[PDB]
């Protein structure tokens, strides 16, 4: 894979809004979004966030990430992290998380990255574990059916 990145652009949003492939994946990234996900909902999320970035390979937008929180000198919290359904398992998220860690260091002088992941998202938990994030706490949340779920809060020092 020859991946590159750049800031997200308007023309990328139609593609990116298609990355959650079912209500579970939608929930994992946008727990208050309504199915189907739409560009208006994605734009609304981006508006609240910083550092929206896309990963590109062979002319295709395959990954998207941003920051949910950013505290200069202190930490950033990874927000959205989504990969095109046809390109999973190929290292796109590993790549883009690395990019976002560099951006955290460079633009915010962060010394820590925080992530949180819903309990049902095994791929997400394993991703972050593989990248050296450690679990710190677990919080109760609710899904769109009002069922109780566990949000696993993790972090990693940035060097
Ligand atoms: S916004 C909340 C998080 N995002 C989502 O839940 C959105 C839906 N999921 C996805 O977009 C992708 O499945 C994510 C979770 C973003 C993973 O993206 P990639 O497929 O690009 O992951 P990489 O190929 O970079 O893999 C890095 C490590 O991640 C773990 N992992 C990925 N996929 C799986 C599955 N299917 N099952 C178990 N573990 C998975 C692995 O630890 C992987 O490391 P390896 O070295 O490949 O083992």
Nearest-angstrom CA–CA distance, 57 and 15 = 14
| Closest approach atom of ligand 1 to CA 95 | 25
Q: What is the DSSP string of 23-45?
A: HHHHHHH-TTPPSSP-HHHHHHH
- The method recorded for this entry reads X-ray
Annotated binding site for acetyl-CoA: 81, 83, 89, 91, 93-94, 121, 126
Measure the N-to-C terminal CA separation of the chain; round to a whole number of Å.
Answer: 26
Ligand 1 pocket mutation pick from 20, 41, 53, 89 by most atoms within 8 angstroms of CB: 89
CA-to-CA separations, 134 to 65, 95, 98, 141, in angstroms, rounded: 20, 19, 16, 20
Q: Are strands 148-157 and 112-118 parallel, antiparallel or unpaired?
A: antiparallel
Listed resolution, Å = 1.6
Our count of domains for the chain comes to 1
Query: CA 70, CA 130: separation in Å to the nearest integer?
Result: 23
- Cβ-based neighbours of 138, under 8 Å, separated by 6 or more: 119, 150, 151, 152, 153
DSSP designation for 146: S
Give me the CATH number covering residue 159. Answer: 3.40.630.30
- Token look-up 């208050």 returns 32
Is-contact 45 82, C-beta < 8 A? no
From the CA of 85, give the closest atom in ligand 1: 11
Atom of ligand 1 nearest to the CA of 82: 11
- 21: domain range? 1-159
Q: List, in sequence order, every residue forming a beta bridge with 142; answer none if it has no partner.
A: 148
CA of 124 to the centre of ligand 1 (A): 6
Distance in angstroms (rounded) separating the CA atoms of residues 25 and 27: 5
Closest C-alpha to 117, from 29, 54, 18, 22: 29
């Amino acid at each position: 894979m020859q991946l590159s990145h750049r800031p997200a652009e308007t023309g990328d949003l139609e593609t990116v809004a298609g990355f959650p492939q079912d209500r579970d994946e939608l929930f994992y990234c946008y727990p208050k979004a309504i199915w189907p996900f739409s560009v208006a909902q994605l734009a609304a999320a981006i508006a609240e966030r910083r550092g929206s970035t896309v990963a590109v390979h062979d002319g295709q937008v395959l990954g998207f990430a941003n920051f949910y929180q950013w505290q200069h000198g202190d930490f950033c919290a990874l927000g959205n992290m989504m990969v095109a359904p046809a390109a999973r398992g190929l290292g796109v998220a590993r790549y883009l998380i690395g990019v976002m860690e560099n951006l955290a260091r460079e633009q915010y002088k962060a010394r820590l990255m925080k992530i949180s992941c819903f309990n049902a998202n095994a791929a997400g938990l394993l991703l972050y574990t593989q990248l050296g994030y450690q679990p710190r706490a677990i919080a109760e949340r609710h899904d769109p059916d009002g069922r109780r779920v566990a949000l696993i809060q993790m972090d990693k020092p940035l060097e």
